[PDB]
Design a protein around this motif. Structure first.
Motif, PDB file in Angstrom:
ATOM      1  N   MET A   1       0.815  -1.210   0.000  1.00  0.00           N
ATOM      2  CA  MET A   1       0.000   0.000   0.000  1.00  0.00           C
ATOM      3  C   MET A   1       0.853   1.266   0.000  1.00  0.00           C
TER       4      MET A   1
ATOM      5  N   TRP B   1      -5.278  -8.819  -0.202  1.00  0.00           N
ATOM      6  CA  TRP B   1      -6.683  -8.537   0.068  1.00  0.00           C
ATOM      7  C   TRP B   1      -7.359  -9.704   0.766  1.00  0.00           C
ATOM      8  N   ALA B   2      -6.923 -10.930   0.482  1.00  0.00           N
ATOM      9  CA  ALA B   2      -7.400 -12.068   1.257  1.00  0.00           C
ATOM     10  C   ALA B   2      -6.810 -12.056   2.659  1.00  0.00           C
ATOM     11  CB  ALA B   2      -7.059 -13.372   0.543  1.00  0.00           C
TER      12      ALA B   2
ATOM     13  N   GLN C   1      -1.062  -8.262  -4.969  1.00  0.00           N
ATOM     14  CA  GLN C   1      -2.101  -7.309  -4.616  1.00  0.00           C
ATOM     15  C   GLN C   1      -3.434  -8.010  -4.400  1.00  0.00           C
ATOM     16  N   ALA C   2      -3.717  -9.051  -5.185  1.00  0.00           N
ATOM     17  CA  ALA C   2      -4.917  -9.837  -4.942  1.00  0.00           C
ATOM     18  C   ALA C   2      -4.735 -10.824  -3.797  1.00  0.00           C
ATOM     19  CB  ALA C   2      -5.332 -10.578  -6.208  1.00  0.00           C
ATOM     20  N   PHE C   3      -3.498 -11.094  -3.387  1.00  0.00           N
ATOM     21  CA  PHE C   3      -3.269 -12.024  -2.289  1.00  0.00           C
ATOM     22  C   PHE C   3      -3.415 -11.337  -0.940  1.00  0.00           C
TER      23      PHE C   3
ATOM     24  N   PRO D   1       1.517  -3.099 -11.135  1.00  0.00           N
ATOM     25  CA  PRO D   1       0.279  -3.862 -11.305  1.00  0.00           C
ATOM     26  C   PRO D   1       0.528  -5.366 -11.324  1.00  0.00           C
TER      27      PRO D   1
ATOM     28  N   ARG E   1      -1.153  -7.717  -9.691  1.00  0.00           N
ATOM     29  CA  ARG E   1      -2.475  -8.322  -9.824  1.00  0.00           C
ATOM     30  C   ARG E   1      -2.586  -9.691  -9.162  1.00  0.00           C
TER      31      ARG E   1
END
Lengths: 198, 103, 19, 44, 174, 129
Positions: free
Chosen positions: D15, D26-27, D22-24, D17, D19
Motif C-alpha cells: 500500500m 486482500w485475502a 495485490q490480490a493475495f 500492477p 495483480r
C-alpha cells in the motif's frame, strides 16, 4: 444542542455564535460560509435594467424556496457530523451559483446567450437541470417578443432587449441560437407589417 | 474442521486473477496480461495442468475466429472430497465452453 | 444534447404559410 | 507477535500492477479485520 | 477527544492534530491525559485523514482542464460517499455507551484503510503527467484490472460515470 | 407605502424573517383603500366594476387567514411553516397592489382604465398565473 443554531444559518437569521474541543470552528466555517452566499443572493435578487433580467431574477427565487423547503423539514435534532455530510452534495452547488452571478452582468440577448454557453460547458454533470430550469424561464418573455412577428406583427419594445429595434420603408435595423432561423424572423415580420398597410 | 475453511477461503481470493484472464482469453479471444504475469510468455502450476491442453487449444483457436464470468461460476459451485474431487467439478465450466469454441 | 426543436417546430410551420 | 508483525510489514509494502500479490494481500487483509474484531471485543 | 478526532478525520485540523503542508496530518507530541502507546495508532489513523484532505482539496481545485477531468472529480465524490456516511455513524455509537476506546474507532475504518492507498496513486499519475483528454478513460481503466476486490468495485463506478460523458457526446454527434 | 415597527429587543433570527412576511400586508393596506375610494360614482362605470371584481379576491384572502387561525389552535403552525402557506397570497396581492397604484398615479377613468388592464396583461405573457 447547537443543531438549531447551525441549521438557522442557512436561513440568514443571526445567532449567538453567528454574527454579521476547539476544532469545531473549522467544521463550523465549512457550513458557515455556505450561509454567506444564501444571504448574498436575496440581497441581489430581491427586486421584481432589463425585462429578461427580471425573469431570470424571478426564476431564481423559484429555486431558493426549494432550498428553504428542504431545510427545516428532515432534521428535528440530528448528529452534528450528519449536518456537514448531508449538506455537502448540496452545499457545494450553492457556492457554484456564486460563480454564475456576481456575488458586470449582461442583459438582453447578451445574457440569454451567455447563460446558454454555461450549459454545454458543464452539461453532463449534476448542474444540468438547475441551469436548464433557469434558462427555460429566463427566456420566457423573450419568446413573447418573438411571438409577435409570427402571429400579430405588433413589434413590442421596452428598453432594447430585442436584437431588433425600430418609399423605402425597410429601415428596421437588425444587426447563440441557430442562425438558420435568425435572419428568417427578421423578414417573417416585415411581411406582416407590410400587409397591415394594405 | 476450521483450518481447511481458512486455507480454502484464502485460496479463492488468490486464484481470482488467473481465472479472470483465462476466461477473458476465451470469450474475448485475446490474452490481456500485465507484466507477463501469466505463465504463457507470448515454471507451471499443476493446479490447472489436467485441463491446460483444452485451454491453449481454445485460446489460439478463438483468436483465428475474430479475424474472420468464470470466477462467478466457480463460487456458486461451492453453494450446491475437498479440492480434489470437488475441484473435478470446476472443469465442466471450462470444458463445455471450450467445446463450443472449437466446434 | 441541445436540440432546439420546441421553438422552430411551431415556427417554421407558420413561416412557409405566410410567404 | 513476530507472525503478525511480519505480515503487517508485508501488507505495508503493497500500500505505502502485479495483480496477484495485490490480490493475495486482500485475502490476508480481510482475515485480519475479522481477527481484530475478536481482540477488540475483549478490550470492551 | 473522540468528537475531536472524528472532526480531524473529516478535514478540520486543530491543536491536538496539527496540519503540515508537506507531510500530512499527525499528532503534535506526547499528551499526559492519554497513554504514550496510543501516539502510534493515531499516526496510523491519520495516514487515512491525509488522503481525504488531499482528496477534497484537489476535488475543489478542479486541477489542466477538460470535461473528462470535471466528471472524474464529479464521480470521485461518489466513491468517497460511504467514507463520510460511515464516519457519521461512529458518533452515534459513542453517544450510546461511553465505554468505547480508540481501538474500536480504529477498527471501524477497516475497509477505508485498505482502499484509499490504492486510489491515491491514480490521482498522482494525473497531476504528475498532465493526462489531458479522453486518455483518462484508459489510465483509470489500466488500474481497474487490479486484484483488490474493493478497488475493482470502486474504479468501475468512476468509469461508469466517466463513460456518461462520452456517451453524451457520442450520441450528440452520431 | 406602509411602514412597520417590530421590536427593539427581539431575536435577530426572527426579525429577518418577519420582514419577509409583511410585504403581503403592506401590499394589502393599499388594495383595501383602493376599494373604499374608487367606488365613488364620480369615477365612471369602469372604475366601479374594476373595484368590485377586485373585492372577491379580498374575500378569498380573508378566508385564507381564517383557516390559519383555526390551524393555529392545534399548534401545528410554526413560523417557518407560515412563510410557505401565504405564498399564493404574496403573488396575488402583489399584482393588485400594482394596478391600484398605477390607475391612480395617472388619473384614469373610462377607456384609459381599460387600456391599462390590457397592457398589464401583456407583460405577464410567460407567468400563466
Amino acid at each position: 444542542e447547537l443543531v438549531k443554531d447551525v441549521l438557522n444559518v442557512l436561513i440568514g437569521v443571526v445567532s449567538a455564535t453567528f454574527s454579521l474541543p476547539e476544532s469545531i470552528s473549522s467544521l463550523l466555517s465549512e457550513v458557515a460560509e455556505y450561509g454567506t452566499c444564501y444571504t448574498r443572493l436575496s440581497h441581489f435578487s430581491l427586486q421584481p435594467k432589463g425585462l429578461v433580467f427580471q425573469a431570470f431574477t424571478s426564476g431564481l427565487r423559484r429555486y431558493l424556496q426549494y432550498y428553504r423547503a428542504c431545510v427545516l423539514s428532515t432534521p428535528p435534532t440530528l448528529s452534528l457530523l450528519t449536518i456537514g455530510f448531508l449538506f455537502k452534495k448540496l452545499g457545494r452547488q450553492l457556492r457554484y451559483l456564486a460563480e454564475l452571478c456576481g456575488v458586470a452582468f449582461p442583459t438582453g440577448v447578451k445574457l440569454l446567450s451567455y447563460l446558454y454557453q454555461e450549459a454545454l460547458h458543464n452539461c453532463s454533470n449534476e448542474h444540468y437541470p438547475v441551469l436548464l430550469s433557469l434558462l427555460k424561464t429566463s427566456c420566457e418573455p423573450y419568446t413573447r417578443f418573438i411571438h409577435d412577428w409570427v402571429y400579430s406583427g405588433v413589434f413590442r419594445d421596452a428598453y432594447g432587449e430585442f436584437m431588433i429595434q425600430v418609399k423605402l420603408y425597410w429601415t428596421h435595423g437588425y444587426v447563440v441560437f441557430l442562425k438558420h432561423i435568425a435572419h428568417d424572423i427578421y423578414v417573417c415580420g416585415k411581411t406582416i407589417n407590410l400587409l397591415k398597410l394594405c | 474442521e476450521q483450518t481447511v475453511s481458512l486455507l480454502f477461503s484464502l485460496w479463492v481470493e488468490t486464484v481470482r486473477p488467473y481465472l479472470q484472464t483465462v476466461d477473458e482469453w476465451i470469450v474475448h479471444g485475446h490474452l490481456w496480461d500485465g507484466a507477463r504475469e501469466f505463465i504463457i510468455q507470448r515454471t507451471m502450476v499443476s493446479f490447472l495442468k489436467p485441463v491446460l491442453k483444452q485451454i491453449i487449444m481454445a485460446g489460439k483457436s478463438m483468436q483465428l475466429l475474430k479475424n474472420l464470468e468464470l470466477d462467478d461460476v466457480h463460487d456458486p459451485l461451492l453453494a450446491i472430497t475437498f479440492e480434489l474431487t470437488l475441484r473435478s467439478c470446476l472443469y465442466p465450466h471450462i470444458d463445455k465452453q471450450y467445446l463450443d469454441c472449437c466446434g | 444534447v441541445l436540440m432546439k426543436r420546441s421553438i422552430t417546430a411551431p415556427l417554421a410551420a407558420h413561416i412557409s404559410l405566410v410567404n | 507477535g513476530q507472525v503478525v508483525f511480519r505480515l503487517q510489514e508485508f501488507i505495508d509494502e503493497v500500500m505505502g500492477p502485479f495483480r496477484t500479490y495485490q490480490a493475495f494481500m486482500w485475502a490476508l487483509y480481510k482475515y485480519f479485520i475479522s481477527f481484530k474484531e475478536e481482540l477488540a471485543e475483549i478490550e470492551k | 477527544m473522540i468528537h475531536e478526532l472524528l472532526l480531524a478525520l473529516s478535514g478540520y485540523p486543530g491543536s491536538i492534530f496539527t496540519w503540515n503542508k508537506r507531510s500530512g496530518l499527525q499528532v503534535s507530541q506526547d499528551f499526559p491525559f492519554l497513554h504514550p502507546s496510543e501516539t502510534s495508532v493515531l499516526n496510523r489513523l491519520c495516514r487515512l485523514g491525509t488522503d481525504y484532505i488531499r482528496f477534497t482539496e484537489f476535488i475543489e481545485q478542479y486541477t489542466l482542464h477538460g470535461i473528462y477531468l470535471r466528471a472524474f472529480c464529479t464521480g470521485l465524490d461518489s466513491v468517497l460517499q460511504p467514507y463520510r456516511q460511515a464516519l457519521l455513524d461512529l458518533e452515534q455509537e459513542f453517544l450510546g455507551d461511553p465505554h468505547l476506546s480508540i481501538s474500536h474507532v480504529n477498527y471501524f475504518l477497516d475497509q477505508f484503510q485498505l482502499l484509499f492507498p490504492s486510489v491515491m496513486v491514480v490521482v498522482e499519475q494525473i497531476k504528475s503527467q498532465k493526462i489531458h483528454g479522453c486518455q483518462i478513460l484508459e489510465t483509470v481503466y489500466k488500474h481497474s484490472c487490479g486484484g483488490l476486490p474493493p478497488v475493482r468495485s470502486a474504479l468501475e463506478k468512476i468509469l461508469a460515470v466517466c463513460h456518461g460523458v462520452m456517451y453524451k457526446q457520442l450520441s450528440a454527434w452520431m | 407605502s406602509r411602514t412597520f415597527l417590530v421590536d427593539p429587543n427581539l431575536d435577530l433570527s426572527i426579525r429577518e424573517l418577519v420582514h419577509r412576511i409583511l410585504p403581503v400586508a403592506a401590499s394589502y393596506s393599499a388594495v383595501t383603500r383602493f376599494i373604499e375610494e374608487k367606488s365613488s360614482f364620480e369615477y365612471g362605470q369602469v372604475n366601479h366594476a374594476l373595484a368590485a371584481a377586485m373585492r372577491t379576491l379580498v374575500k378569498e384572502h380573508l378566508i385564507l387567514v381564517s383557516q390559519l387561525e383555526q390551524l393555529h389552535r392545534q399548534g401545528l403552525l410554526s413560523l417557518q411553516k407560515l412563510w410557505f402557506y401565504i405564498q399564493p397570497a404574496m403573488r396575488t396581492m402583489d399584482i393588485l397592489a400594482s394596478l391600484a397604484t398605477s390607475v391612480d398615479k395617472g388619473e384614469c377613468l373610462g377607456g384609459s382604465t381599460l387600456s391599462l388592464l390590457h397592457d398589464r396583461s401583456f407583460s405577464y405573457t410567460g407567468d400563466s398565473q
